[PDB]
Design a protein around this ligand. Structure first.
Ligand SMILES: NC(N)=NCCC[C@@H]1NC(=O)[C@@H]2CCCN2C1=O
Ligand SMILES: NC(N)=NCCC[C@@H]1NC(=O)[C@@H]2CCCN2C1=O
Lengths: 496, 497
């Protein structure tokens, strides 16, 4: 099965309202930049972002010029002429609109509240999809909280019901309408809805993990924002999942959620695979087409794992654009984020940056020894290991933010496509390294094991293993006189 | 309120059937050994044991001569003439009958299954109670677990309803019929029903904790079987309550159930107190009137916390009776258990035992340097600390197993009564020691705390404390923008006044 390659196309309301493909000063990345070749390397483009309004319906920014919006969307759907598998999805939400303190947060909470609010909301998503010509719905609420999760799940189920009906009504069996969400790629936010992951993923074609922004100026020490595996020399974090609303025992929580742990892409993927009912084929690994920069770092590990003096607030609370050579940072008034396109230009500009590589995390980073700057980012090299992991772990594919950040030749996208699809690319010998793997074990990823059938009437010693009801169990202490599932002394440790 | 003093009177079916008060080789402990003085020192006598038959009703062992059974019980209820507060309870169950692998275990599981079975069983308990002249029902199922607990709770509730009505019918308001159970005194068995303790205890007058047998040959390291407090030098154990179906977070489980921990009497009592809705007044501390012996122990620490070579199978699989001076052990065929009566004799018999004391656990022990023996037991001195604990912790009283093991003068029973009631006993200056106390805190026994009210729309740093919906909450990590409650970021740490 072809791996999904999902790229976000984000365009601010002012750029839509002033849309032009001939003046990068107004619209830095117009649709025309997505050439036929690039359209063929994508399976999905997530047009972003739409929102949920006070009327609790899916809707465009109230300030959007609808006729201009329709034309931009039509340009995107026109790309399907070059790739019959291409889908132009539209994304609802994003951090700005939906975070707990975001401008539209209450609308998300209220829209999933009742059977009626959900029906109205689901209907609006499908109506918007059909009216503008989109191929599916992607919801990026960052993020529903424990008490809102059942409502969220029910809303997704409703949209799924309506989309499947629309697929048949439109004769779209060959390319069914889809439903996806952008899911948390870090344990802290993930813990909000983790316990009900299976129910959340059931109505989805994919859950696209935001497995990046795992480091930022909001953290005390610099770190890689999307390390594939862990580096023992780097910072470790509290494993929030042990506090998720699971109802599991201490042994179960402990074995599934070691703490502290390394916040990496592998951790997030493995945490999802640990839940039963969450299929690897629906998990999509997100990757960033941008880097995060920090100032005020010290030497010793090339800028890595160092204290820093970078403001963590949004918007950037200063006028000091200190990321040397980053012209896009001046345009966007924030030196803490730089597109791969800009970083590549900074590297060939002799600005004082050294490109270094961490072979544990399998990610590159820049160090500016003169100015004390550190940049964590991803590139065509880190993408080889992530692509191999996606294939080995049988994931659904890759997602990335965002298309306008790739370089002019579309090298990052081309690399992802190459790694999955090129007949002459062979990563059989690619060394995945010795970085730390997440070793938690849960209901969903128990190892295959064998053990004698449990025998009623037998008394078991501590550490004994038996098979019962299709799983292998081990005793937590001795003199066990009742059965697995009915005596708490038994721990499920394997399957089959 | 007077503290309860609940003593078991256990008599095997063969002794009932050949009951005699003039031949200790047939009946070692006849009822006649309970004088008026002893009757006045007790508040309850738990006659044991009755069972639950295949008809799922309370019943005597089928092999019991009924007339002889009534005569033994009559000797016990006649003691009431000497103490108007005394109750002769009858106990249903016990280890032999009710353990998972016991001969009658199925009957316990099936009797509590449905409204009909529970009604039938509860009616039979009250019928036996009235027919034989008992003053209450005590159930000692060791122990219900899983799906059985809800049924058990409903059966207890049903018996309570029937007893209360019987009390009114009989005009027994001055000494109402009572309902109690023997409860696990250790976390492993306690974990079976721990999550529903409040519901189990609601219909009871008392839950009598079997806070003994916390050490035994079944364990690789010798230890005190009923330490009041812990000795950091002794063995520690996995806290099984961490595995009960409580629905608590990892932090809550860890805070409530330190692990490994010292299996002590204080741990069991504190573990019950940690659960919301379990009143200290209903908690009864059990104590043993017998000791457990180990052979093959090493020198150095008086036989304490040493490897040993003591058989663990039951029955005692050997014919070797190695507990020096213990002839009772010969009569009963097991050198691993001895009554306080017999142990006291071994101490007056110049057999080479040293009586030592652990000032952390507040318990005595015997050490036979010559033969490599260790005996853990309780005596009048250890009962001083336990009785003071009962008073300080406002527990309902003390329970013990069993009356036949006290010495002929009834000194252990006399000591307990004295510690609770004698005007001439003063423990105000008795030092409880520095042994390890159980310090778990449960979401159901949080301290009063004070914090600013939670402000919606605020972002909280790690470790911040706020008050919200009756509790004080602490954040487990930073940048918290969610409200306290089920949300993973917040931990209930205190109660708002
Ligand atoms: N200015 C900053 N931080 N840019 C990085 C934006 C990362 C971007 N934010 C989002 O909310 C969407 C949700 C879907 C995935 N997204 C992103 O990667
Ligand atoms: N021979 C031995 N092991 N004697 C110790 C028996 C302890 C005794 N056993 C039980 O089942 C009753 C239930 C009520 C309290 N019990 C005991 O202490």
């Amino acid at each position: 099965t072809r791996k999904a390659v999902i790229g976000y196309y984000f365009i601010p309301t002012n750029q839509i309202n002033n849309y032009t493909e001939t003046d990068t000063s107004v619209v830095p990345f117009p649709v025309s930049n997505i050439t036929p070749a690039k359209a063929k390397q994508l399976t999905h483009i997530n047009f972003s972002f739409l929102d949920i309004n006070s009327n609790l319906e899916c809707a465009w920014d109230p300030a959007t010029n609808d006729a201009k919006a329709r034309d931009v969307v039509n340009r995107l759907t026109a790309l399907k002429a070059h790739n019959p598998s291409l889908r132009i999805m539209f994304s609802i939400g994003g951090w700005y609109y939906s975070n707990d303190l975001g401008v539209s947060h209450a609308n998300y909470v209220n829209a999933v509240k009742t059977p009626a609010s959900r029906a109205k909301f689901a209907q609006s998503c499908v109506r918007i999809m059909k009216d503008y010509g989109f191929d599916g719905v992607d919801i990026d609420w960052e993020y529903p909280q424990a008490a809102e999760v059942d409502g969220f799940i029910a809303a997704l189920q409703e949209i799924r019901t309506l989309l499947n009906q629309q697929t048949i009504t439109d004769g779209r069996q060959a390319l069914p309408y889809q439903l996806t969400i952008a899911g948390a790629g870090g344990a802290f936010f993930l813990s909000r809805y983790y316990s009900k992951l299976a129910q959340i993923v059931a109505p989805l074609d994919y859950i696209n993990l935001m497995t990046y922004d795992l480091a930022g100026p909001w953290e005390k020490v610099t770190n890689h924002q999307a390390a594939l595996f862990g580096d023992a020399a780097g910072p470790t974090f509290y494993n929030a999942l042990r506090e998720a609303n699971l109802g599991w025992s201490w042994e179960e929580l402990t074995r599934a959620f070691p703490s502290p742990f390394s916040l990496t892409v592998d951790a997030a993927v493995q945490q999802h695979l640990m839940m039963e009912g969450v299929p690897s084929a629906k998990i999509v690994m997100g990757v960033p087409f941008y880097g995060r920069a920090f100032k005020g770092v010290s030497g010793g590990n090339g800028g890595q794992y160092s204290s820093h003096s970078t403001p963590g607030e949004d918007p950037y609370p200063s006028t000091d654009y200190w990321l040397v050579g980053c012209e896009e940072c001046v345009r966007d008034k924030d030196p803490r984020i730089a597109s791969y396109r800009q970083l590549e230009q900074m590297l060939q500009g002799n600005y004082g940056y050294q490109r270094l590589w961490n072979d544990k995390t399998k990610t590159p980073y820049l160090y500016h020894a003169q100015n004390g700057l550190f940049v964590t980012y991803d590139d065509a090299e880190s993408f080889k290991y992530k692509a191999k992991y996606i294939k080995q772990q049988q994931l659904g594919g890759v997602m990335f933010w965002h298309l306008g950040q790739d370089n002019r030749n579309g090298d990052l996208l081309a690399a992802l496509d190459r790694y999955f699809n090129a007949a002459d690319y062979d990563d059989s010998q690619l060394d995945m390294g010795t970085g730390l793997r997440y070793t938690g074990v849960g209901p969903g990823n128990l190892p295959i094991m064998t053990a004698p059938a449990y025998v009623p009437g037998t008394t078991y010693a501590q550490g004994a293993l038996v098979s019962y009801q299709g799983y292998v169990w081990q005793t937590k202490w001795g003199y066990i006189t009742s059965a697995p599932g009915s005596d708490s002394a038994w721990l499920k440790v394997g399957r089959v």
